[PDB]
Amino acid sequence: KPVIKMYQIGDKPDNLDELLANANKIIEEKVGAKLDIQYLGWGDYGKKMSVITSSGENYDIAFADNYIVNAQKGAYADLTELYKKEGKDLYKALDPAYIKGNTVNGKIYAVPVAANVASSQNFAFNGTLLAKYGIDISGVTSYETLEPVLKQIKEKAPDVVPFAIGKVFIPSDNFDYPVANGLPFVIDLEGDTTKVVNRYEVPRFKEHLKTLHKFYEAGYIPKDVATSDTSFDLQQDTWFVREETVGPADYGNSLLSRVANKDIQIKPITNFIKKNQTTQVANFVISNNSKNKEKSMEILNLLNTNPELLNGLVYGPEGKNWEKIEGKENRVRVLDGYKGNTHMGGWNTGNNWILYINENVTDQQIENSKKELAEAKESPALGFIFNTDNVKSEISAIANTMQQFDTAINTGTVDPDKAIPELMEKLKSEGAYEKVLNEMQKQYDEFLKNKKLE
Numbered sequence: 001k002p003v004i005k006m007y008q009i010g011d012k013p014d015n016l017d018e019l020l021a022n023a024n025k026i027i028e029e030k031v032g033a034k035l036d037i038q039y040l041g042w043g044d045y046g047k048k049m050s051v052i053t054s055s056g057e058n059y060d061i062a063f064a065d066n067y068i069v070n071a072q073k074g075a076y077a078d079l080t081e082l083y084k085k086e087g088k089d090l091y092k093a094l095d096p097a098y099i100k101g102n103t104v105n106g107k108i109y110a111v112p113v114a115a116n117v118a119s120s121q122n123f124a125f126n127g128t129l130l131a132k133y134g135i136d137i138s139g140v141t142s143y144e145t146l147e148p149v150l151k152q153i154k155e156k157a158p159d160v161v162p163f164a165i166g167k168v169f170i171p172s173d174n175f176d177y178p179v180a181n182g183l184p185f186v187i188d189l190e191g192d193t194t195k196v197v198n199r200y201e202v203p204r205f206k207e208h209l210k211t212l213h214k215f216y217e218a219g220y221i222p223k224d225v226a227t228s229d230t231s232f233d234l235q236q237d238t239w240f241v242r243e244e245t246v247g248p249a250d251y252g253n254s255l256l257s258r259v260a261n262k263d264i265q266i267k268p269i270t271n272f273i274k275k276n277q278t279t280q281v282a283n284f285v286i287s288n289n290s291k292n293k294e295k296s297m298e299i300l301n302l303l304n305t306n307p308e309l310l311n312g313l314v315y316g317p318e319g320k321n322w323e324k325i326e327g328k329e330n331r332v333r334v335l336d337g338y339k340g341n342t343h344m345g346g347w348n349t350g351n352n353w354i355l356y357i358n359e360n361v362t363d364q365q366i367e368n369s370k371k372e373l374a375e376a377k378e379s380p381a382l383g384f385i386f387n388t389d390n391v392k393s394e395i396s397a398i399a400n401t402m403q404q405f406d407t408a409i410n411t412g413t414v415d416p417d418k419a420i421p422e423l424m425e426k427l428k429s430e431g432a433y434e435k436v437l438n439e440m441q442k443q444y445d446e447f448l449k450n451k452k453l454e
């Protein structure tokens, strides 16, 4: 039984050995291999995985970073044939938007987790503090309208971080990204949807960055946001508000209330839509240098199709963390063991449709989810995936410049009125910027042109 090496983002569960022992009972039997998972953390997952992939390291499975760029670098196994056999079952369950968003030169290199194919960005509020301090959030619709409630929590509970964001944070908006959000190129969904634009020059987005900087100056965001490895545990009163992606797989605020083990209230700030990001939010890839591509896909297939296996990991050990509710099909309740770091997250583990539904999820939530999924629309740029063939060096150059300046801007640490012009000047200094922008606009023109009937 070879050991299959999987890399995952974020922090290791405290009972990983138990989780994997439970999981490997099923995997070893069905596949003849043992899964091992190594977790790489949150704050620097991109940098870490870039060492792994650019070095051609042996691994079998990974949660992808910079998927569209690396797929064109040949970092990942083409899954075209594996999806005809080992991954046939998981593949049948994917919404067409997952195929559009993850197809690169006519080939799919990822197993995306079937879950929030559409979603919106939300502020998620700590209900303990809302109730304790009686703070009114009914006006909260944007980064800007957040200000009065952060001012209040700051005055009332000085030990609480008002807005908990960390170094990986990027302000959200109604944008589609033809590459990924570590680059500035977006389609503005509220603007001219035929144009590729620089997010730092979109007026309202520049305004958000100003807002974040004012929050940073006011002490609403951590002083060391740009460098901190501190997390804000969903269960703890260390934070008042944070930004969360929510979609139909979460059943409204039930999932965040379950994981936080308290009432979490949400407020949307972006449109609920299928767009490149929502289809790429959890992609598993197989290393193109893997020596076990078939068993790797068999594991990914099981993670996405076997409810015993998936629930065992996402809920944790049955009996300790959760139990089936008698005479209610596919319903569970969590138990004391589930409280904290003793399970994995559904969104980056496997098809959320095969997850048991927890007791705290209401019939209204179930009906809302069904309705939201049925009505979700596609962004006009869903499936517009930028081809890097002509701009390989210029893309690297842009990414290099971005890595060096973008954390201080995105977190509000530096004044964006000073920093954005410095970043733009550096991006333009050797013309890598202009070349990539023009090529992206030319491809986008073709993409849109070819959908119009002759």
Ligand SMILES: CC(=O)N[C@@H]1[C@@H](O)[C@H](O[C@@H]2O[C@H](CO[C@H]3O[C@H](CO[C@H]4O[C@H](CO)[C@@H](O)[C@H](O)[C@@H]4O)[C@@H](O)[C@H](O[C@H]4O[C@H](CO)[C@@H](O)[C@H](O)[C@@H]4O)[C@@H]3O)[C@@H](O)[C@H](O[C@H]3O[C@H](CO)[C@@H](O)[C@H](O)[C@@H]3O)[C@@H]2O)[C@@H](CO)O[C@H]1O
Pocket: 010, 011, 042, 115, 116, 119, 121, 164, 165, 166, 168, 169, 170, 172, 181, 231, 232, 233, 234, 235, 241, 242, 243, 244, 245, 246, 247, 249, 250, 255, 256, 259, 277, 278, 281, 345, 346, 347
């Ligand atoms: C409840 C649930 O499972 N919800 C999921 C969503 O998580 C998922 O959205 C995606 O979420 C990832 C992960 O971010 C969240 O989890 C991070 C880890 O939290 C856990 O571990 C911590 C210890 O490391 C614990 O402290 C914590 O209790 C928990 O155990 C967490 O750190 C993160 O919150 C921080 O970071 C976010 C992002 O910067 C920031 O907004 C927060 O304020 C806070 O500082 C979250 O709680 C996330 O990485 C994904 O982000 C990418 O994709 C989105 C959507 O495109 C982009 O906007 C964003 O810029 C990133 O590119 C995404 O948000 C959804 C996916 O559909 O599925 C739900 O079911």
